[PDB]
Write an enzyme that holds these catalytic residues in place. Sequence first.
Site, short mmCIF file in Angstrom:
data_model
loop_
_atom_site.label_atom_id
_atom_site.label_comp_id
_atom_site.label_asym_id
_atom_site.label_seq_id
_atom_site.Cartn_x
_atom_site.Cartn_y
_atom_site.Cartn_z
N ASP A 398 0.83 -1.21 0.00
CA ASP A 398 0.00 0.00 0.00
C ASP A 398 0.86 1.26 0.00
OD1 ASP A 398 -2.34 -1.58 0.06
OD2 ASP A 398 -3.29 -0.24 1.53
N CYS A 432 -2.24 1.03 -13.50
CA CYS A 432 -2.46 0.90 -12.07
C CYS A 432 -3.77 1.57 -11.65
CB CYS A 432 -1.31 1.49 -11.28
SG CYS A 432 -0.72 3.07 -11.85
N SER A 433 -3.63 2.73 -11.03
CA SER A 433 -4.78 3.54 -10.66
C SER A 433 -4.85 4.77 -11.60
CB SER A 433 -4.75 3.91 -9.16
OG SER A 433 -3.69 4.79 -8.83
N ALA A 434 -4.04 5.79 -11.33
CA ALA A 434 -3.91 6.95 -12.19
C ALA A 434 -3.02 6.61 -13.40
CB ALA A 434 -3.34 8.15 -11.41
N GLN A 479 6.86 7.98 -10.41
CA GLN A 479 6.53 9.09 -9.52
C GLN A 479 7.55 9.45 -8.42
OE1 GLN A 479 3.51 11.45 -9.18
NE2 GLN A 479 4.09 11.17 -11.33
#
Length: 500
Positions: A398, A432-434, A479
Amino acid sequence: SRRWFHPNITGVEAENLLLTRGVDGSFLARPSKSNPGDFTLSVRRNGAVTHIKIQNTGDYYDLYGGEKFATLAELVQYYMEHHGQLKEKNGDVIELKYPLNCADPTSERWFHGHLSGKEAEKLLTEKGKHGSFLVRESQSHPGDFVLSVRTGDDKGESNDGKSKVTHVMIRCQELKYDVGGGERFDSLTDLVEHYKKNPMVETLGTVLQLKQPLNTTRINAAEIESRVRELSKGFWEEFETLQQQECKLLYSRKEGQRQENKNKNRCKNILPFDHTRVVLHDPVSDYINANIIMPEKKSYIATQGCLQNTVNDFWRMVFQENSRVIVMTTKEVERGKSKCVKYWPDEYALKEYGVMRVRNVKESAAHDYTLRELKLSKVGQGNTERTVWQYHFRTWPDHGVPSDPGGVLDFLEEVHHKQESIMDAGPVVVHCSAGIGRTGTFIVIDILIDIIREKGVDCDIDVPKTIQMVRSQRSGMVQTEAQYRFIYMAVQHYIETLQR
């Protein structure tokens, strides 16, 4: 462009500069010392400095009391344009007006710093080219600096006397740099910028042209472990040097900004570049938050976790691009917040998503991931059937990155071979997510390792250069420095598995 980022500054230095050199509307941005990987936007407002929190958990920059962004430079561009949009708790408008420039040259690509005059002339002779330059600290006259420039015809170990390295002394004096006469500059950057526009010309006519820096990130794959060591005293100057080149990447994202498309974005401000976006073809919307990623044979589609409204679009793209392998690098939910909606059927279940129809043929459980075999077809035409393999990576933490790269590697390895076993298969879909932090991390590792797997442990790899290339194709790819380091860790670990 990024002079407003001060990388090695304390919160207290931050306020001083803003109060002593600043005026209302002045601002700078800086990396948090309290929560590493988080940052702080400081805006002198009303005689005072207010500080604004920015978090990056590896997915995006979350402006505390604002919106999520892909890069700091997109963040800043956004609020020096959508004004009145930045507000504190209580409604007042935070005004970003005057970039407060940083004078630290360390993050410049062309700045080395502590470096010998002989080790530098080797680099220039060896790896340099015409117009290759660098700026180092002077050993001779401490506190001052030296600018060295190669000028000539061809590159590399040359003996024809057609090239030469010239050295200019740069004196730091009362806090201003000069090259012996003329104008005195506020920073190293300003001097260098000046003399790139207006080359120095030697008495006898040679033009000291500043064309490109000298690459010092490319390394032979075989020696990766030694560079890992060098950078773990390095890794920080290296990440930050890379981060400053994100200002050259402010390409347009107009399609993503259209009203008809705003609800198709996971995060309204994180958008696919127009010039690399995936365009849906065959009364139909052509938009999906997805970019083609091309190494520069095998290619990728970097995209987001599906939304309820975009599931049908996902499958249109997948069918259109002839993609036959999907790489999912997120749980549906992480930290209780939803990351991707379930775009696949349950095992054995057939579903329709618009004109697209998908069967979950078989699942397959493994230590680090779940593999789903999906059969995609277009409604109406029973001949459009193709198998799409979904590699779902279950074991990414996470917070932060995995402490050991083996799962990722065994995963990409298997993904790699599936792709290779299918002739004419289209780009490999990764999300993934974004679809920027983890997605870019995965893609970059897969690229570096595709290079090694081909050319061998004896080849050239350049991590920052490769990451930069990928970011020019989708905003913010990779990132965090945590992720950066992990990429190194994983390539290293991949060499040491090859040579064993």
